[PDB]
Structure formats: C-alpha cells, structure tokens
Design a protein around this nucleic acid. Structure first.
Ligand SMILES: Nc1ncnc2c1ncn2[C@@H]1O[C@H](COP(=O)(O)OP(=O)(O)O)[C@@H](O)[C@H]1O
Ligand SMILES: Nc1ncnc2c1ncn2[C@@H]1O[C@H](COP(=O)(O)OP(=O)(O)O)[C@@H](O)[C@H]1O
Ligand SMILES: [Mg+2]
Ligand SMILES: [Mg+2]
Lengths: 646, 407
DNA sequence: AAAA
DNA sequence: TTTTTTTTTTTTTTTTTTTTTTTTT
C-alpha cells in the first residue's frame, strides 16, 4: 500500500523522513518500538500501513523477533487508551541524538510549505499562511484552550536556558499574551524571508524567455512589498488571532493536574506511579501546571540536615511504634487522590512541637498543595445557611489541612464533621460564581492543649478518629530526673524553616516514608499495629461521655432503691448534672430517651404497659448521699522500619 | 575561542568593545574585579570564554594568582543563587570613569542598527524596528512587568534634574502611561533620522554608475515618506505596544521591596546590611519602589533637635536600663525581616506620654512602613458571621504597629 | 497628467 | 447580621476606512 502513502499528503512522507533518523538499535529495543507504536496509535487509526512499514524498518531480526509482534500491540485493540506517550515526542527522540539532519529536514519542510504558498498566491502573504507556517515550525511549545467563562488562554512549555521564574522548569506556565511568540515571528521568520528572497533572485539570475523577464520581477516586487508587513503590530495581532485556532487542543484545561501521582517540584516533576519514585528533568507530555519550590533529592541519611531532623523527630515522640504510625500517616499528604477516612487529633500541653511540626509539613508540601484551616469549620455550632463561606474552600486538590491551638476546650458536633472525613463529595457556594461540587482528598490533623468536647456515641463517628497524647514537654530548666523533659531552641522555629535545605531533607524523608508504606501492605493505614495508638483512642472514648459518667456516679452501685417515675425526671437529673458537672447546652429529649435504652440501664429499663418506659428503680442522689447499697527500642536506626513486628 | 567569541554573538562584540577604556587597576584589585566577574557570570552561562578572556587582559592576575581558584569561583557563580548583577551596572562605571568616548560608540552602534534595517528593507519603517532601536538605547528606565490583574505596568527610574515629587529620587516609580517615552521617541529619534538622511545624501553626492541614478533616489524618497510616521499618534501607540514586549522583565513585581536591609529614604535608599549604614545617592540596581519623606542624616548629638529629643526621652522614663531596653526594642521597627516574637504593653497615667512617642515613631517611619491598628482586633468575638475583617491587610510589609488609648 |  | 456581596460596570473602540505618492498609462 505504498501508493496509498504516496497519495495521502506530503505530511506522511514528512513523518517518514523524520522517523528515518531512528537508529536500528532503537528499533531493536522492545520498549522503544512498543511506545512508538503506542504513540502512532494515539494519533488516529489510519496509520496501520505506516506501522506495517515500521515492521520492516530495519528488520534485521523481525523474523527472529516475531513477525506478528509489532502488529500484535495494535491489531489486538485498535481502540482503547492508556494515557501513554503520544506524538509530540518522536521529534524529541530524533533530536536528542540526531542533530543536523533533523534540523535541515524540518527547515526544508516548512521552507517548501512557505514557497508553495508564495508561488501559488503571487507573493501576497496573509495571516493564515504565516500562522500555519509558525504552527508547523513550532507545534511542540504552545497550547491553547478555553476556560470556564470562555477565553483563549495561552500555555507555553518552559525550557532551561531562558528567562523564567524560580521553579517553573519543565512544566507549562500560563501566559496572558504570547510574548515569545511575537518575538519569534518578528525575528526568526526573517531568516525564511531571506532564504525565499535568495531563492527568487537565484532563479531570476538564470536567463530564459519572456516568462521570466517580467513574471519574476513582478512577484519579486510583490514579495519585497509584503516582507515589511511581518513587523507590523496589527498584522501580527491578526496572525496570532488566526493561529489561536491551529494551536487549539480539546480537553486540556480540565485535565490539568488531574493525575494524583505527579508532583511539580522546583527542579522538574516528580512521579510516584512506580517504585521507586522517578524524577523527570527532560521533555515529557504530562499536563501539569501547579508546582512547589522544593527541590527533590533521594533520601540520603548521611546528610547532616537529615540526621538532625531524624534526631529531633525521635526526641519529639519517644514511642517507636507511635512514631512510625505518625510518619506513615503524614506521608499520605503527598498523595492527592482518594484516601481512607482517618481523622487525627492529638493533645498536649505547653511546649509540644505539634504546631511547629504542622508548620514544617505545610511549608515543605507547598502552598498549592497544603492549606491552613480555621477551627470554626469544626466548631459545628454554626449552621451555614444559604450564604457564602470561603473558609470551606481551599480544599480543591489540596492534600493536607492542619489546625492550631484554640482559646479553650470547644465542642465539635458531628455536623460539619461527618462530611469532612468521608471520601465523598461536598458542595458550597462563595462570592460570585455559583454552587459547585468537588471531591475532597486532604488528610486532616488538629492538635490542641485543651481537650475537644465530643458528644456522640455512634460507632460510625468513633471509627474515623485517632487520638494520641504527647508525653514529652519542653522547659527552660531540664532537670536530669525524668526522661520527658529537654532543652529548647528559639532558632529551632525562628530558623531551620527558612533554610531550603531543611525543606529538601524533609521532602526526601516524606518520599522515603511513602515508598516504605507502599512497599508494605498495598498502601492503607488500618494495618501495621501500634498498641499505644487506638488504645489511647479507646481510653479517650471511655471518657468524653457524660451519660456513662452520670450513670456510674448516681444510679450505679445503688440499684436496691426505687425512686423512678419516667424518662422525665431522669432527663431533669441529667440536665442539672451535666449543667453543673459539665458545661450548659440544649438538647432534645428524644435522643436521650432513645440512648437510655442503648445505655447500661437495660437491666432496669422495662417498658410499662402504658408505655412511659418506666425504669424498674434506682436512687437519685442528693446532697452527699453516701453508703448507697450496691515497645522494643531500636538499636541504632529506626527509619529502617525494623522487621515486620517493628 | 576568541575568534569564536567575536564570531557568533553581536552583544559579545558589543561587550568586547565596552571592555576597553576600563580602569585595569580595578581588575588588579581583588574585590571589584571579583564583583565584575560575578556580574558577567550572572549574564548567561555561555560567557565562559568571554570571562576567561576578561581574566586574560592584564595577564598578571591570571599568571600570578588563583587561576584554578578563579575558575572555581566562576563555576560556583554559574551554579549558585546570589546576586545577579549585570553589565548595566558596568555601563554605569564605564560612564563614571570613562566619559565622552562611550557616547560616540553607542551612538554609532544604534545608528548602525537603524542603517542596517533601512538598507535591508528599502527604508520601509515599521513598529518593530523602531521599538528595537529604542530598546537599544534607554534600558536605564521603563521596565515593564505584568501585574496580578493581568495589565502591563510601566516603571520609570527617576534621576536628578527631572520633574518629580518629593523623595522619588534614585528609585523606581509606577507610571500609568510612559509619557517620557512618547516625548523621547518624538524628539530625539529625529536626530538619528537626520543622521541617516545626511548619510544617504553624502553617498548620493559621490559619483557612481547608474545605481545612484535610480536606487538612491528611490531609497531617499521612501525614507522621506517614512520619516513623518514617527509623529503620528497611532504609529507611536503601535510602537509602544510592540516595545513593551522587549522591555518585559520576568520576576520583577513580586521581587520588589523584598530586601529587608534596604529602606526607601527621602534622599535615595539606605544600606543597613553592613555596619555602618550607608546612604546610596547614585545609580544602582536594587528594585526599590516604596519610600518615606524623611531625609536621612548621620546621628549627630551636637544637633540642637537631637539634644532636645534625648533630654525628652530621659525625662519621660528615669530608669536607665529600662530606657535602653525599650529604646533597643523600639529601634527594631526599622528592620523588615523576621524578628523575635514578643509583645510589649505598658500602662500609666493620663500624662504618661506613651501616646506621643508611638505617634512620633509612626510619623517618622511613614505610612508605607508604619500602620495603626484597632484595639478591637484583640478583643472581639470570633467571625462566626462569616463577614470578612477590615484590618488583616495591615502588617503586610509593615515594620511597626501600635495600639491607641481606650476609656 | 490621470488613473490604479 | 447586616453587609457587601452583588451589582454595576467594563472595555467601545481599535482596527480601520479613507487613501498612498508614485507608478502605470
Ligand atoms: N529537637 C529540638 N531541639 C531544640 N529545641 C526543640 C526541639 N523540639 C522542640 N524544641 C523547642 O520547642 C519548640 C517546638 O515547638 P513548640 O512551641 O513546642 O510547639 P507547640 O505549639 O506544640 O508547643 C521550639 O521553639 C524549641 O525551642
Ligand atoms: N518630655 C516632655 N516634657 C514635657 N511635657 C511633655 C513631654 N512629653 C509629653 N509632654 C506633654 O504631656 C502631655 C501628655 O502626653 P500624652 O502622650 O498625651 O500622655 P499620655 O500618653 O498619658 O496620653 C502631652 O500633652 C505633651 O504635650
Ligand atoms: Mg507547637
Ligand atoms: Mg498620650
């Protein structure tokens, strides 16, 4: 079907010529031709003859390597996509090792296009022709798409060796106006103009009859008149407007940063799809726009900053299992996709380092991925009616949200808490715009020196919470008596965060911990046992429950007496109790009446014939009313995770 | 690589021309020579042979000194983050020490650029070529950057002898529309146009073959037709719109006033980076925009006002140690970097004098650096009503804040 | 000198 | 819990066009 290739445009032969530069050993390498055939698969489906020819491109071992091998990867499923390497990269592969011939090939290609136009239209250039030439001579650097309200936005791929901001290398950036496009079309297009002029003059030099006496002279005059138009402002604006359509790429803005396995770092892009994590500092095609200014380096414990951070972290939390669990939980901040519904809250007193730690994670992870959340969200006392609340945002794409110390112990009702931990979707509206729904995937931590007042009993609420209590405090007089006391350092917070090397070391530690967790039981947090954790949590759940305390304080150990009317006097006694014993708050009697059955009073809770669920009998206490009748410590390194028990 | 140095890069030839007429004693001296080497290294990493040749002129340093040390210094300058000085500064020293001869050099340079364009395109001027020629001159002023609102903004560097407000000297100012650029392109570019016309007239005067019969006549007619375009308003607007692309400088607005050791003073800027403080009243490259209307003079206790203020300070609070401590703490407001996190609060009678001092500090530091807050910020209910506050925009870039009295 |  | 967010604007022409003197007749 070579004649089909002959008839099907000169672009097919252009691709033929550019791919001819691929060495035979490149075609021998199995992944190389695998990804090449995938790339040609992504570009339409009529390139089956081209792939068949590629089977015979340097076929020194096609029979040895299997005749039905290259076509197998395409004929098995011509449809279907895998988000793999498409075109826009074969040219890069050719250029990375085969200069000179590649550049002259592309030069003669767009020169032929422009010469065809100038011959066809008698040297009268216009906007569309110049736009097409520009797009042909660089289609690998700019992308245009339409945003929400509807505009044409220009994105350009940044390369080393050009003016730029810090950390925006090897990734797209948003340009309000394509400045470099104007500079290029004004500067480098003059080279093609000079080449065309020299070609025309050379053709005019050779003598012939009247067909060249005036025809070349007329077209030469027209071309030299039209040459100066490329320096115009209105003409250039029109050319840019025309080229806006050629650079159009459907489905690019809404696919930006959608992949949760790609992170934008200061020195490129970080990929955590495969183990170990891979850093890309060359040409690629992943559509990433957001980034952080933290350079990524492999986790090397020999670095002095890494050693200092590891020692400080070990000093902050003594328990090995708890430390490992905390680091594993914090390593999930790197991920931005769906995560298990876990809420972490851990208490303390005075100097605990909790807030300081939160700050390190926030700065290391960057602004585009981490956020600061107000406690008013989890106060749950305020019920947001139909009105904007910007505090509920700042969770789009973020993978980390942390809180701070509050004024005093505060209540946290299950409302505005159940939907903040679940892997579901939530909706809210803010200034301008309208209501929208977004998936939330941010790990949340909230530490305080005052206990959170939790008023609930359902297992559903008490299953996505983990509670820890720090045991090491910091005081300016570290008496060498108890281990839970150490000296402080003002520069431990005033500095050690501004220095970028500390952020690099912490990022390396986070990446290493995420890799270690992934090499473990296929991710997840529920496994890997830590006896201290979830045991402190169940102990906390034993407390923070006024009803059980009321029952064990007033009616338990005094069952012999019988002073019970109905749920009403029990409600009043509990109300005066909790009002005095605890804070004052308003409640609905139905919840208490229903929970009383679920309480430990079932041994005396029996529904009377006329309902009223009269308790069989207890004693309500007034006045004093006494006499009522009834681990291994790691040797030298702990980041090595120890064996499986750890 | 010297032939390669003057083979490929036009501004490489320009820098080679500039490197002459220099005070080589500064090259001999380690500090200033190291500074200019750092500045050249910050101007792209492809100038390694150029820097080597600059170290080769007056070969005494390259023969008697740390040749490997100098190479390592240039390498680390290439691959480290620090000052990014540019030849601009150099151009300033070249003007300061070697006047006159540079003027004709730059004049002939941009005249050559314009003449090359005219000869290449048959005297058919257009926005881009005049924009590029204008950018060949200036560079001193009119730096363009994109704001957060997406609008291009022009910043003009103020020099003595210009119509400006008080305290705007030796620092950038925000310009809604480059009026000086329009005036300059309309006025001074006519001189270069007249030079081109005289050049072509002189070549027309000399006798040659039939080329002068028609070719120079056509070129002169085209140039005469195109000369009047520079006075047209639409042409000037297009030229400015095209020129703002060349003057565009990445990472300028967000890198403005970021240095905490430089303070915009009424006589320029202050360099509190090193002891003692220096006042800069000449050309520089620090991106300073904000300023205060308070002139700076060295601390002279003999001045009557200084004596009066010191006596008043002594009379306000008697304790010597307390006076020194509070004065040291109050002097921290001049800095704008991170500081020790401590809060000072002091009470007293109706004639305590607390308010007066706070007011003097605020007035001296100016509105840009000092701000007054509201006492209700500390004593208020939580913003459960979701209504945004009106005070947290304060302290952004400020170095001082004070609270007033309350009954 | 009048039209492109 | 008004209050300010929402509402009110926001660019509105500019581009051009015309011609363009010289060139062709
Ligand atoms: N490893 C350490 N080395 C030196 N000082 C430390 C260390 N860990 C904690 N500190 C001291 O304690 C503080 C850590 O933050 P901290 O104030 O305890 O946070 P929190 O808000 O949880 O109390 C630092 O200011 C420092 O002085
Ligand atoms: N050093 C001083 N010597 C004499 N009078 C002073 C001095 N400082 C302030 N005063 C006067 O004393 C009054 C008290 O100043 P003010 O700061 O208002 O007191 P307070 O701070 O208690 O309100 C001012 O009216 C001022 O004129
Ligand atoms: Mg803390
Ligand atoms: Mg006062």
């Amino acid at each position: 079907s070579l004649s089909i290739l002959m008839l099907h445009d000169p672009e097919a032969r252009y691709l033929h010529k550019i791919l001819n530069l691929l060495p035979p050993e490149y075609y021998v390498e199995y992944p190389l031709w695998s990804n090449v055939v995938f790339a040609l698969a992504n570009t339409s489906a009529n390139y089956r003859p081209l792939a068949e020819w590629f089977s015979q491109k340097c076929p020194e071992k096609w029979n040895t390597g299997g005749k039905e091998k290259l076509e197998k990867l395409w004929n098995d499923a011509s449809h279907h996509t895998e988000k793999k390497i498409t075109k826009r990269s074969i040219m890069y592969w050719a250029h990375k090792h085969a200069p000179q011939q590649y550049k002259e090939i592309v030069e003669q290609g767009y020169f032929s296009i422009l010469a065809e136009y100038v011959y066809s239209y008698n040297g009268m250039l216009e906007h569309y022709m110049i736009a097409k030439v520009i797009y042909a001579m660089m289609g690998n650097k700019f992308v245009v798409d339409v945003d929400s309200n509807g505009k044409y936005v220009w994105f350009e791929f940044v390369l080393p060796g050009q003016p730029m901001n810090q950390g925006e290398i090897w990734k797209w950036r948003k340009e309000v106006n394509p400045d470099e496009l104007h500079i290029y079309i004004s500067e480098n297009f003059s080279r093609v103009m000079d080449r065309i002029t020299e070609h025309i003059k050379y053709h005019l030099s050779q003598p012939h009859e009247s067909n060249i006496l005036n025809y070349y002279k007329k077209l030469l005059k027209a071309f030299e008149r039209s040459k100066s138009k490329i320096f115009n402002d209105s003409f250039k604006k029109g050319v840019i407007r025309q080229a806006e359509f050629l650079f159009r790429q459907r489905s690019f803005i809404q696919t930006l940063d959608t992949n949760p396995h790609l992170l934008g770092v200061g020195n490129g892009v970080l990929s955590i799809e495969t183990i170990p994590a891979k850093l890309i500092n060359h040409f690629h095609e992943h559509p990433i726009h957001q980034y952080t200014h933290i350079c990524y380096v492999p986790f090397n414990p020999e670095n002095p900053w890494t050693k200092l951070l590891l020692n400080a972290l070990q000093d902050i939390i003594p328990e090995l299992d708890a430390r490992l669990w905390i680091m594993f939980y914090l390593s999930t901040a790197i991920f931005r996709g769906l995560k298990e519904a876990l809420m972490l809250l851990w208490l303390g007193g005075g100097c605990n380092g909790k807030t300081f730690l939160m700050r390190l994670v926030a700065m290391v992870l960057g602004d585009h991925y981490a956020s600061k959340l107000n406690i008013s969200l989890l106060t749950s006392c305020r019920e947001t009616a139909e009105k904007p609340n910007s505090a509920f945002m700042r969770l789009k794409g973020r993978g980390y949200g942390y809180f701070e110390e509050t004024n005093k112990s505060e209540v946290l009702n299950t409302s505005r808490l159940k939907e903040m931990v679940n892997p579901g979707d939530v909706t809210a509206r803010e200034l301008n715009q309208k209501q929208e729904s977004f998936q939330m995937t941010a790990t949340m931590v909230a530490a305080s020196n005052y206990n959170f007042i939790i008023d609930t009993t359902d297992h559903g609420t008490w299953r996505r919470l983990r509670h820890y209590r720090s045991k090491v405090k910091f005081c300016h007089n570290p008496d060498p008596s108890n281990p839970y006391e150490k000296k402080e350092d003002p520069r431990f917070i005033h500095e050690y965060i501004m220095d970028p090397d500390c952020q690099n070391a912490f990022f390396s530690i986070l990446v290493y911990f995420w890799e270690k967790l992934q090499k473990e039981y296929n991710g997840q947090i529920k496994k890997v046992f830590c006896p201290t954790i979830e045991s402190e949590t169940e102990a906390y759940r034993k407390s923070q429950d006024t009803l059980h305390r009321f029952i064990t304080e007033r009616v338990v150990e005094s069952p012999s007496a019988e002073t019970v009317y109905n749920l009403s006097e029990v409600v009043t006694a509990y109300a005066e109790w909790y009002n005095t014993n605890i804070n004052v708050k308003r409640h609905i009697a139905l919840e208490l009446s229903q929970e009383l059955e679920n309480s430990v009073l079932e041994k005396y809770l029996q529904w009377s014939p006329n309902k009223t669920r009269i308790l069989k009998g207890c004693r309500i206490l007034h006045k004093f009313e006494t006499l009522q009748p009834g681990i291994c410590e790691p040797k030298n390194k702990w980041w090595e995770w120890s064996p499986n028990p750890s």
